[PDB]
Design an enzyme around this catalytic site. Structure first.
Site, PDB file in Angstrom:
ATOM      1  N   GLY A  31    -104.011  -2.651 -32.147  1.00  0.00           N
ATOM      2  CA  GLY A  31    -105.217  -1.987 -32.011  1.00  0.00           C
ATOM      3  C   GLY A  31    -106.111  -1.971 -30.962  1.00  0.00           C
ATOM      4  O   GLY A  31    -105.594  -2.210 -29.634  1.00  0.00           O
ATOM      5  N   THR A  32    -107.414  -1.301 -30.976  1.00  0.00           N
ATOM      6  CA  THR A  32    -108.236  -1.158 -29.774  1.00  0.00           C
ATOM      7  C   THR A  32    -109.090  -2.202 -29.819  1.00  0.00           C
ATOM      8  O   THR A  32    -109.067  -3.268 -30.671  1.00  0.00           O
ATOM      9  CB  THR A  32    -108.983  -0.118 -29.834  1.00  0.00           C
ATOM     10  N   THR A  33    -110.038  -2.566 -28.838  1.00  0.00           N
ATOM     11  CA  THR A  33    -110.890  -3.558 -28.496  1.00  0.00           C
ATOM     12  C   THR A  33    -112.099  -3.013 -29.162  1.00  0.00           C
ATOM     13  O   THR A  33    -112.471  -2.085 -29.512  1.00  0.00           O
ATOM     14  CB  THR A  33    -111.089  -4.089 -27.174  1.00  0.00           C
ATOM     15  N   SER A  76    -110.230  -3.224 -36.478  1.00  0.00           N
ATOM     16  CA  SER A  76    -109.272  -2.910 -35.415  1.00  0.00           C
ATOM     17  C   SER A  76    -107.950  -3.338 -36.006  1.00  0.00           C
ATOM     18  O   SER A  76    -107.860  -4.103 -36.970  1.00  0.00           O
ATOM     19  CB  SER A  76    -109.338  -3.599 -34.147  1.00  0.00           C
TER      20      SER A  76
END
Lengths: 245, 249, 204, 244, 231, 244, 251, 241
Positions: A31-33, A76
């Site tokens: 995932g993204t932050t 996320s």
């Protein structure tokens, strides 16, 4: 001895660890932050939302969905699965609001979602969650903020992160409570929520992104979860560009 | 949820069910327990053991009352004994006591506990119970009576018997000390004495639990004034009482 | 009308010393019309005797119900059921159908084999165990039975004093009642020997 | 997954043959002998217990003779635990038939019913079969005495004299050799003890390993009385046939 | 190993392999290209027949009088979802007097796909739909993955050799949005787009199927002689 | 590859069980179908395995309703469950709107039943455990598009064919069709056209006790032809190939 | 329990059907031959097992209706379950749709019982193959059908299932004419007896003959009938041999 | 073949799976020490805060179940919230149907059964947590009942848990062996907490701060946890020792 311990998840490996649930943590890393600053006033969420191509539409897609009228939930990992955990608490909160006639506390909600994500680690018929959520809000017990691992474990926090840039985000929030020892208002804290996402886009400097920022604060929106937008946002972006140069 | 609806008790290729045999293995790891059926009582004895000496064994029950005439004692798993004592109490009252107004005969209650054993070999998703019980009791039609219920799900009536880790030694000692006529005071004198060649820890009344289903008591009934009812024939002996009789061996 | 007075029927039961006796009429009517002068209302499971009054069909249903339950008792515990134990099963079967019940009124009569005591008991519709050591009467000539039975009866009777008392008690209510009579059978139940004696009596 | 852990007890092998059924009959050979001999005046049922001990009460153990109903008894070969479940189902099934038709259940009907329950588990549900085999001694007005063996697969075939359980081969062949149709119960008793003397897995044919029962037409008033003998009457009859 | 035939089990590399395999169902399907503007959205689909005597497979499915879905995956799996979209479109009209929003209809869709990827014996749907529609927010084009992930796009494509269409659209992106009130051209820019996915398959009056949605046009599917003025 | 589930894949990414079902179409006996504007001919090889056989009780042509017929090849017991639903569906529609069901709508409804394999998935009940292994040639006549002939797959996908074959000799059948089919066939040339293709892919002699013809014309509805008329027609094929 | 225990195979079969067909081979043989006014179903009764009372024992032929009979070969435990459902449907037909069953309905129904179990989980298919024969009511033509474990049925004019099926059927192909069946009932019995004595042999205990006639006449022939017919075929056979023997010498 | 992956018995008559639950109750690494006073019962636990960002208040391992019964949990925190939840639900349920407040004796038995039922069905995972239940009963005096993953429980004079618990158990052992009484004598509860902290400072080989402690005390009819300010006060009383 034996062969396996990764085919089912109501096995326990001999060490005292799980699997699948131990493996599901690697899934959230893809995932993204996404960050949360717990302010004195409320909470301020922010999420890195990748823009792959110009084929997609900017400011039209979201990873910040509201639950109840006063709780951001921002997630996320695997995004449909993360949306199912958000879906679940919309149901849960509406029932509580029917039953007891008050806005659902954040500490109540924290217990409720926690039990469900735990619940999928106790059967082999369903898959363990492979997302982590960072959620909080403002209720009448003050501002609160939580992170809930797919392990079914959650704790109190005053700053959280998850995803690829969780090393730089965790460290830069350490710096953020150590700048300010008496804390900071949510209006200023919009500007730090932008800065540390841009610093956690150096783990994703093969890509380009659009920044979503949202807030729930007692006195900037009257305790209600809204999106930050317009003129206030463009100022958060400018601060963050200077900070990384 | 559930998604198991197939047995895990299965026959082996040379015959014999594999699972009911394994379950019987877990029993002979456990404590040593005995029951001696006399002409005027049944005495049962078992040995009490704890995690640590900071654990009490006075708040743990390795002898239970199912009805005021029929008691239980085990060798095997503590946890399995716990659930199997409670389900027996519940079925003793619900599948006979309500309907017939009195408590079940010893035979009749034994027969009922044997079907519970059976449904943990049969039916999906379950494994067998890992206890062998002695169920000693008294009914009006079989006199005093001793049975041994096993994980197999079959029961056998005995004259005296042993189960546990000392079972083979115990029964060789019991062969020579069972007599046709045994008085209740003599019966206690054999049962403590057998259990003593199967103890290697402490020997005190706080580590040896003994219970008689002797003859009846109109002093643990809780009332007087109905002469139909004659109180509990079951009477568990506190640590002190058992201890006097250890000094008198 | 009344769901327990639409074919009538009566049962009387008395104790004596060392003996009991029970007796029923043999009338099955459908209202006013007499259909039969040879339907039993007494049955016997083992050495227990269960007389059942009230609606026609539930006498019969209930006979095959306890026929089922008595078989399973005997098979498991390897004896014939005792009078006292059985009375509890007669109570529970009525009570299970607490709403819309069996419109009967049975009478349990025996002599215990484990103590040698005459023992009798009764039931209403819903079934309340009615202890006695006198006599228990039930049915549609039961108002008459309660007066008549008490008056002749002396506490404890000999086995064949008992045949003369319970016979007269039954006759005289049954010929002052319209839905009772019409041939009757009186039983004398001693320790081990039951005689079934039909009675000469008024058919009109 | 849960699909992993499934045994598959209800599949055909490549031969066309049911693993769990072949094994069920296999395990019933560990369990004690059971014999039935059908006379033309009764049936003798005689069975040798699968276990004996010197501390065991041998005078209320029932693991071989069990009454399903008033006029129909079984001899048991298999595990007794398994048999106890089906025995309370049969007792019910009999007692129902009496309830609705007011006549006692034919022997044919009660035996086909037991086989159908057994068949059911090998047919559907993924549950083990019960490893039990019964010889039925039973009477009805319809053909008089009937003797029958059913197996864990769920099929019944009539017999004149039959054996299930331990040393099956040995008992059945011997039975053919001594069979006459002129036997009466006195003779039928004698041959049933004599065949058990040849299959005996101990020192001698002793009372304390025998359960023994009959259903006799010599019993009073022209009606079958089922007599399950006590071990004190077995000990008496064991002197009569002259073995001891 | 057995991580690949169980939809309930991870995967030491942090995946599930079944959703991935299910994403390969889209690659072996046929090609379709969608492009949208602010007043009109368009689907331009390449139908694909089996042999000479076989008919051509319809690849634009009418969902409503203002909503359409087009498959590019496997056809049997698409028949379960098509009903589902219709069902929630009539429920939204029925109860709330609302012509079901396109963006919200995506969010329903997600959770139907997810709940079978969570559950064993279940599967992710192998189909991936491109969903057009005209509400009060204007025209929209959604791309629905077998993952259950929905994304909102000016124009995209899925199927076989989809990457070349994405390129034709990445260039011509800033031309067609500023086309407004001229459906004629919007239809013309997608014909050129799906032509880059061919490999001598050509476009005829039996191969081409276009369907449009407007602010002044309902849902319409053109086929036969109606797409023969747009070859 | 993976057959340890029924909704398992496949790095290919297609249903694995469905892939296995398509290959059980090539063990049927050939069903041929020519659709024209005068009607549709459905012809089938019935197959004769024995001359003890009664071959006429083996049918592969069945009437669903007055204006729709079906031809099955593959496992004809599977076709029993699917032909049953077709019969019920078509009749249901004639109650509910009192009108002809489209050939298209009919075909489509039957694709939905085949896709109901599974151990439990979707918002619906999976009530099979493995997929059908039969292919249909649903012929018919609807009042929208005239005569139409569809091929209903065990996949659950339907394509409208001018002419299709299914079966063992499918592959070689369809090759002749690519050249010999045109829209200027007359009806009785279609009947000879079926028997031409059927004789080539025949694994026996061509005769009338292992072949059956059927039509759907407006003028007399669906009629399945007698064996006498099939004989005449087999011989008239034989006359025009000797005018060569 | 819902697990798939029937799973399509990549051979283009189901392994559970092919294996059940194999279950059927191990049965004891039933032969079916139809006359012009009778059907005759005979079955092999084992003669290994001895002191088998047969007064009370179930026949290997079971009457479903008073005019439609079924025989069975393969697993004999499974056979009675199909018989049970088939008996109940026969009397339902009489109840709601009226009229006694046709041979064709009953067969078609039995085909639907095994068919259903072929595509349901949590079960396995039956391993029983049936010969269902009888007369339709208000007609007098013999009807002889065979259902198989797949759930498919075909009519025949003679058929055989079970053990050694190939050897008999091979015989029946060469001693029967499908255009003109056996003229009478007697000839039809003598041909079924001749087939059983091939594979089965071993006395006349094994042979059972059921004859069904139209107008609801089921009669089963006792041992004495069987024996008359067995003796005629053994002599005829012996006599031929002897007249071949004279002819060889002559040449 | 498989028997270490589900909940069927092994050849040895043991459940390996049940054995792994006891090696999964130590992953927290937290030590607890629980002693019975005269009229009070005391439980002290370690509490660690791994980072700056985490707030200690929420980090807890002492969960209040009844209003008289607390429960101190060693082992993983998912199995702790689920175990807290069920135990709490039951506690309410008992009040509802028998009209008094739940005896600890019975909640220890109650949860023992449910624990067991998870080793008795194959799908259901058993809960890898050791729960120590502290109370002051109104009929049964001060008590401690400790459940464990088998669905066994037994009473205690005193008990300890965690991985380093061997050291702790022996210290406890000496005090009651020397004394020859089964419970600590002292009426003021303040001092039973004091005694407890010393026995932990000696056993674990460490001194403490207020944040390293989280202290729960059950007096009569109430359960509370002491604030961190108040806990400093308990630490000064060890210099007066």
């Amino acid at each position: 001895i034996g062969t396996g311990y990764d085919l089912s998840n109501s096995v326990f490996s001999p060490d005292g660890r799980n699997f699948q649930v131990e493996y599901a943590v690697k899934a959230v890393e893809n995932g993204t932050t996404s960050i949360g600053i717990k302010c004195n006033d409320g909470v301020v969420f922010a999420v890195e939302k990748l823009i792959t191509s110009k084929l997609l539409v900017p400011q039209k897609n979201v990873k910040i969905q509201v639950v109840d009228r006063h709780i951001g939930c921002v997630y996320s990992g695997l995004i449909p699965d993360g949306r199912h955990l958000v879906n679940r608490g919309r149901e849960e909160a509406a029932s509580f609001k029917k039953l007891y006639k008050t806005p659902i506390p954040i500490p109540a909600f924290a217990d409720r979602l926690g039990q469900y994500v735990q619940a999928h680690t106790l059967y082999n018929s369903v898959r363990p969650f492979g997302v982590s959520t960072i959620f909080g809000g403002v209720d009448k017990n003050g501002a609160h903020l939580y992170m809930l691992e797919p392990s079914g474990s959650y704790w109190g926090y005053k700053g959280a992160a998850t995803g690829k840039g969780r090393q730089s985000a965790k460290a830069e929030l350490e710096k953020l409570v150590d700048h300010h020892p008496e804390g900071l208002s949510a209006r200023e804290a919009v500007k730090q929520a932008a800065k540390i996402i841009y610093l956690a886009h150096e783990d994703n400097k093969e890509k380009d992104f659009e920044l979503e920022i949202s807030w729930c604060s007692l006195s900037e929106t009257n305790g209600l979860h809204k999106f930050v937008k317009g003129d206030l946002l463009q100022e958060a972006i400018d601060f963050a560009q200077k900070e990384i140069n | 949820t559930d998604r198991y609806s197939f047995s895990l008790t299965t026959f082996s290729p040379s015959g014999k069910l594999g699972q009911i045999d394994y379950a019987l293995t877990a029993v002979k790891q456990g404590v040593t327990s005995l029951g001696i059926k006399a002409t005027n009582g049944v005495v049962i004895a078992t040995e009490k053991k704890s995690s640590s000496p900071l654990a009490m064994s006075e708040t743990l029950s390795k002898v239970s009352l199912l009805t005021p005439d029929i008691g239980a004692v085990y060798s095997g798993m503590g946890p399995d004994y716990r659930v199997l004592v409670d389900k027996s109490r519940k079925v003793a009252h619900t599948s006979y006591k309500r309907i017939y107004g009195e408590y079940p005969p010893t035979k009749l209650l034994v027969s009922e506990v044997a079907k519970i054993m059976q449904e943990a070999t049969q039916s999906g998703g379950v494994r067998p119970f890992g206890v062998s019980l002695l169920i000693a009791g008294h009914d009006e039609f079989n006199g005093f009576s001793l049975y041994q219920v096993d994980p197999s799900g079959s029961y056998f009536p005995w004259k005296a018997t042993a189960i546990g880790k000392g079972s083979v030694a115990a029964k060789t000692f019991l062969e020579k000390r069972w007599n046709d006529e045994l008085e209740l005071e003599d019966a206690i004198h054999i049962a403590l004495l057998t259990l003593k060649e199967s103890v290697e820890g402490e020997f005190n009344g706080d580590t040896i639990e003994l219970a008689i289903i002797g003859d009846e008591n109109p002093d643990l009934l809780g009332y007087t004034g109905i002469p139909t009812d004659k109180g509990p024939r079951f009477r568990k002996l506190t640590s002190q009482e058992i201890n006097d009789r250890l000094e008198a061996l | 009308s009344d769901p327990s007075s639409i074919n009538g029927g009566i049962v009387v039961a008395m104790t004596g010393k060392d003996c009991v006796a029970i007796a029923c009429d043999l009338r099955l009517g459908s209202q006013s019309l007499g259909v039969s002068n040879k339907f039993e209302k007494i049955f016997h499971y083992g050495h227990v005797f269960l007389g059942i009054t009230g609606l026609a069909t539930d006498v019969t249903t209930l006979n095959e119900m306890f026929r089922y339950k008595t078989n399973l008792y005997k098979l498991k515990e390897e004896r014939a059921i005792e009078p006292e134990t059985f009375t509890q099963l007669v109570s529970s079967s009525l009570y299970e159908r607490r709403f819309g019940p069996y419109f009967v009124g049975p009478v349990v009569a025996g002599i215990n084999s484990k103590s040698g005591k005459p023992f009798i008991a009764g039931f209403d519709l819903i079934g309340c165990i009615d202890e006695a050591k006198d006599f228990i009467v039930s049915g549609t000539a039961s108002d008459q039975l309660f007066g008549m039975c008490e008056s002749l009866y002396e506490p404890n009777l000999e086995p064949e004093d008992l045949f003369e008392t319970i016979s007269q008690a039954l006759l005289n209510a049954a010929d002052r009642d319209a839905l009772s009579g019409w041939g009757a059978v009186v039983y004398i139940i001693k320790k081990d020997e039951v005689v079934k004696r039909y009675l000469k009596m008024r058919q009109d | 997954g849960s699909r992993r852990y499934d045994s598959r007890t209800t599949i055909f092998s490549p031969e066309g043959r049911l693993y769990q059924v072949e094994y069920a009959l296999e395990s019933i050979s560990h369990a004690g002998t059971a014999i039935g001999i059908m006379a033309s005046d009764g049936i003798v049922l005689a069975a040798e217990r699968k276990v004996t001990s010197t501390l065991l009460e041998q005078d209320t153990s029932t693991e071989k003779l069990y009454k399903l109903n008033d006029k129909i008894a079984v001899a048991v070969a298999g595990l007794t635990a398994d048999a106890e479940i089906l025995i309370n189902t049969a007792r019910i099934h009999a007692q129902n038939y009496l309830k609705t038709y007011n006549e006692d259940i034919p022997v044919e009907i009660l035996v086909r019913r037991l086989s159908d329950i057994k068949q059911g588990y090998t047919q559907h549900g993924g549950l083990r079969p019960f490893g039990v085999s019964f010889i039925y001694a039973g009477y009805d007005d319809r053909y008089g005495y009937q003797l029958y063996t059913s197996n864990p697969s769920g099929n019944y075939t009539g017999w004149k004299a039959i054996s299930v359980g331990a040393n099956t081969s040995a008992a059945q062949t011997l039975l053919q050799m001594d069979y006459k149709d002129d036997m009466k119960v006195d003779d039928a008793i004698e041959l049933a003890l004599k065949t058990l003397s040849k299959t005996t897995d101990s020192s001698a044919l002793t009372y304390d390993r025998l359960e023994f029962a009959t259903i006799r037409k010599g019993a009073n008033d022209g009606e079958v009385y089922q007599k399950i003998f006590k071990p004190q009457e077995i000990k008496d009859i064991l002197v009569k046939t002259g073995i001891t | 190993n057995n991580y690949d035939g169980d939809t309930v089990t991870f995967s030491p590399t942090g995946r599930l392999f079944q959703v991935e395999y299910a994403l390969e169902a889209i690659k072996q399907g046929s090609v379709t290209v969608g492009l949208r503007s602010n007043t009109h959205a368009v689907l331009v689909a390449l139908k694909r027949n089996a042999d000479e005597l076989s008919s051509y497979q319809k690849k634009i499915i009418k969902c409503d009088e203002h909503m359409g879905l087009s498959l590019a995956g496997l056809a049997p799996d698409a028949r379960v979802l098509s009903n589902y979209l219709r069902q929630q479109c009539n429920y939204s009209s029925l109860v709330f007097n609302r012509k079901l929003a396109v963006e919200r209809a995506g969010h329903l869709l997600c959770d139907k796909a997810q709940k079978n990827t969570q559950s064993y014996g279940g599967r992710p749907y192998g189909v991936g739909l491109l969903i057009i529609g005209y509400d009060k927010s204007g025209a929209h084009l959604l791309e629905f993955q077998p993952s259950g992930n929905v994304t909102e796009l000016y124009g995209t494509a899925i199927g076989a050799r989809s990457q070349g269409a994405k390129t034709y659209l990445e260039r011509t992106l800033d031309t067609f949005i500023k086309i407004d009130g001229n459906p004629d051209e919007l239809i013309k820019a997608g014909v050129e787009a799906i032509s880059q996915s061919l490999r001598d398959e050509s476009l005829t009056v039996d191969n081409l199927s276009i369907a449009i949605v407007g602010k002044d046009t309902p849902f319409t599917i053109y086929d036969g002689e109606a797409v023969a003025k747009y070859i | 590859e993976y057959d340890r589930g029924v909704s398992t894949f496949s790095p290919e990414g297609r249903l694995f069980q469905v892939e296995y079902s398509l290959e059980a179409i090539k063990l049927g006996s050939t069903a041929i179908g020519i659709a024209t504007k005068e009607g549709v001919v459905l012809g089938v090889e019935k197959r004769a395995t024995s001359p003890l056989l009664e071959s006429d009780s083996i049918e592969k042509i069945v009437e669903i309703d007055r204006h729709i017929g079906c031809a099955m090849s593959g496992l004809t017991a599977d076709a029993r469950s699917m032909i049953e639903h077709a019969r019920t569906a078509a009749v249901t529609h004639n109650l509910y709107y009192d009108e002809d069901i489209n050939v298209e709508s009919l075909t489509q409804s039957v694709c939905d039943l085949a896709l109901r394999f599974g151990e439990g998935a979707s918002g619906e009940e999976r009530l099979m455990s493995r997929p059908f292994g039969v292919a249909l040639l649903i012929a018919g006549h609807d009042a929208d598009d005239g005569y139409q002939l569809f091929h209903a797959e065990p996949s659950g996908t339907f394509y409208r064919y001018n002419a299709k074959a299914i079966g063992s000799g499918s592959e070689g059948a369809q090759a002749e069709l690519l050249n010999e089919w045109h829209s200027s066939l007359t009806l009785k040339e279609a009947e000879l056209l079926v028997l031409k293709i059927l004789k080539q892919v025949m694994e026996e002699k061509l005769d009338e006790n292992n072949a059956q013809l059927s039509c759907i014309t407006k003028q007399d509805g669906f009629k399945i032809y007698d064996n006498e008329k099939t004989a005449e027609l087999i011989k008239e094929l034989k006359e025009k190939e000797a005018a060569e | 329990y819902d697990r798939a225990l029937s799973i399509f195979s990549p051979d283009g079969h189901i392994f559970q059907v092919e294996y059940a067909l194999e279950a059927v081979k191990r049965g004891t043989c039933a032969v079916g031959v139809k006359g012009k006014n009778c059907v005759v179903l005979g079955c092999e009764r084992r003669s290994t097992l001895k002191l088998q009372d047969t007064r009370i024992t179930p026949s290997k032929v079971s009457k479903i209706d008073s005019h439609v009979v079924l025989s069975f070969s393969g697993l004999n435990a499974d056979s009675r379950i199909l018989i049970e459902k088939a008996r109940v449907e026969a009397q339902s037909h009489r109840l709601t749709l009226e009229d006694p069953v046709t041979v064709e309905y009953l067969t078609r129904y039995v085909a639907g019982v095994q068919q259903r179990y072929t595509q349901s989980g949590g079960v396995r298919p039956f391993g029983v193959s049936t010969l269902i024969a009888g007369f339709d009511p208000r007609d007098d033509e013999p009807k002889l059908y065979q259902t198989e474990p797949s759930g498919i049925y075909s009519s025949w004019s003679a058929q055989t299932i079970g053990r050694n099926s190939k050897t008999v059927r091979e015989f029946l192909e060469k001693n029967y004419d499908r255009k003109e069946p056996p003229a009478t009932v007697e000839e039809c019995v003598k041909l079924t007896v001749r087939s059983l004595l091939e594979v089965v042999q071993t006395g006349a205990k094994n042979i059972e003959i059921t004859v069904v006639k139209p107008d609801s006449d089921i009669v089963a022939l006792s041992s004495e009938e069987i024996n008359q017919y067995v003796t005629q075929i053994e002599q005829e056979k012996q006599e031929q041999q002897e007249q071949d023997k004279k002819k060889k010498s002559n040449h | 073949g498989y028997d270490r992956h589900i909940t069927i018995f092994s050849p040895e008559g043991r459940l390996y799976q049940v054995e792994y639950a006891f090696k999964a109750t130590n992953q927290t690494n937290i030590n607890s020490l629980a002693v019975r006073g005269k009229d009070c019962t005391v439980v002290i636990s370690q509490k660690k805060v791994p980072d700056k960002l985490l707030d200690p208040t929420t980090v807890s391992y002492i969960f209040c179940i009844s209003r008289t019964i607390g429960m101190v949990v060693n082992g993983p925190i998912p199995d702790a919230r689920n175990a807290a939840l069920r135990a709490k639900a039951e506690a309410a349920e008992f009040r509802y149907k028998y009209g008094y407040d739940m005896p600890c004796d019975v909640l220890a038995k109650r949860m023992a059964n449910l624990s067991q039922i998870y080793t008795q069905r194959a799908y259901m995972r058993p809960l890898g947590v050791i729960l120590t239940f502290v109370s002051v009963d109104e009929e049964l005096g001060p008590s401690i009942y400790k459940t464990d993953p088998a669905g066994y429980y037994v009473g205690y004079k005193a008990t300890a848990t965690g991985p380093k618990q061997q050291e702790i158990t022996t210290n406890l052992e000496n005090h009651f062996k020397k004394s020859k009484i089964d419970h600590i004598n002292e009426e003021s509860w303040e001092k039973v907490v004091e005694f407890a902290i010393t026995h932990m400072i000696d056993a674990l080989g460490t001194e403490f701060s207020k944040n390293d402690l989280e202290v729960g005390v059950a007096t009569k009819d109430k359960f509370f946890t002491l604030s961190a300010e108040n806990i400093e006060e308990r630490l000064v009383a060890i210099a007066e020792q």
